[PDB]
Amino acid sequence: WVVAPISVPENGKGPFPQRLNQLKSNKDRDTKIFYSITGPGADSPPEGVFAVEKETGWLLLNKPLDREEIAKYELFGHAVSENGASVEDPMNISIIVTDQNDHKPKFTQDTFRGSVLEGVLPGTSVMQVTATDEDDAIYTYNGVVAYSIHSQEPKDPHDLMFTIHRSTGTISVISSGLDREKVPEYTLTIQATDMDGDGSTTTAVAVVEILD
Ligand SMILES: Cc1[nH]c2ccc(Cl)cc2c1CCN
Ligand SMILES: [Ca+2]
Ligand SMILES: [Ca+2]
Ligand SMILES: [Ca+2]
Ligand SMILES: [Ca+2]
């Protein structure tokens, strides 16, 4: 028989065991048929994730999936007559694990550093920060990053002298007045928010050094 690939959102919560699909042998007219399942997730590590009911053929999921651990399973179903003979061809069972937004973006570094000549103009780029989200960024924004500036210290000649590009993470100088003799170094706190700014948010540091 044939089962069409099955899409299960990770991190579900049943109730378990959850019935995913029912395997059927045509030959249950000449005998009772005993069903069984084999493959990664069933009888090899990680064992017990999937299972099939001996008599009914109901395909079972026994625990929530974690797409970030195993995104896809390829199981194999088998029909055995009561007298012990295999009655069908081994049927492939495809399980695809679909993403929920269960990861917080992380900066590639705890502290990014960069320099600029005291005299550069507003609009000048200093550095490019990056954050990585293990969630899916293809069909959803669960792993898309929005960048923000958390805070600026110190605040002379005033606050918010830097902006960050929302998608690229490029930090730029937006105001005049830089001066090494007055403030050699600015310590920015940077933020990264998945769902393109709507979800979880993590922080890092950006140290901008002012070059005489
Ligand atoms: C590839 C794919 N296709 C989907 C179709 C529907 C839903 Cl809700 C989610 C998905 C995903 C995310 C898996 N990374
Ligand atoms: Ca997960
Ligand atoms: Ca995420
Ligand atoms: Ca996820
Ligand atoms: Ca929110």
Swiss-Prot record:
In which tissues has expression of this protein been reported?
Answer: Expressed in some normal epithelial tissues and in some carcinoma cell lines.
A single GO cellular-component term from the record reads:
cell junction
GO biological process, alphabetically ordered: adherens junction organization; calcium-dependent cell-cell adhesion via plasma membrane cell adhesion molecules; cell adhesion; cell migration; cell morphogenesis; cell-cell adhesion mediated by cadherin; cell-cell junction assembly; hair cycle process
Q: Which UniProt keywords apply?
A: Calcium, Cell adhesion, Cell membrane, Cleavage on pair of basic residues, Disease variant, Ectodermal dysplasia, Glycoprotein, Hypotrichosis, Membrane, Metal-binding, Repeat, Sensory transduction, Signal, Transmembrane, Transmembrane helix, Vision
Q: What cystine pairs are annotated?
A: none
How are the domains described in the entry?
Answer: Three calcium ions are usually bound at the interface of each cadherin domain and rigidify the connections, imparting a strong curvature to the full-length ectodomain.
List the molecular function annotations (GO) for this entry. Answer: beta-catenin binding; cadherin binding; calcium ion binding
Q: Which residues are glycosylated?
A: N92
Keyword ATP-binding part of the UniProt annotation: no
Name the record gives this protein: Cadherin-3
Which disease does the record tie it to? Hypotrichosis congenital with juvenile macular dystrophy: A disorder characterized by congenital hypotrichosis, early hair loss, and severe degenerative changes of the retinal macula that culminate in blindness during the second to third decade of life. Ectodermal dysplasia, ectrodactyly, and macular dystrophy syndrome: A form of ectodermal dysplasia, a heterogeneous group of disorders due to abnormal development of two or more ectodermal structures. It is an autosomal recessive condition characterized by features of ectodermal dysplasia such as sparse eyebrows and scalp hair, and selective tooth agenesis associated with macular dystrophy and ectrodactyly.
Q: What assembly does the database describe for this protein? A: Interacts with CDCP1 and CTNNB1.
Of the parent protein, the shown chain spans 109 to 320 of 829
Q: Which residues form the Cadherin domain?
A: 1-107, 108-212
Which organism does this sequence originate in?
A: Homo sapiens (Human)
State what this protein does. Answer: Cadherins are calcium-dependent cell adhesion proteins. They preferentially interact with themselves in a homophilic manner in connecting cells; cadherins may thus contribute to the sorting of heterogeneous cell types.
Instruction: Write out the annotated subcellular location.
Output: Cell membrane
This protein's encoding gene: CDH3
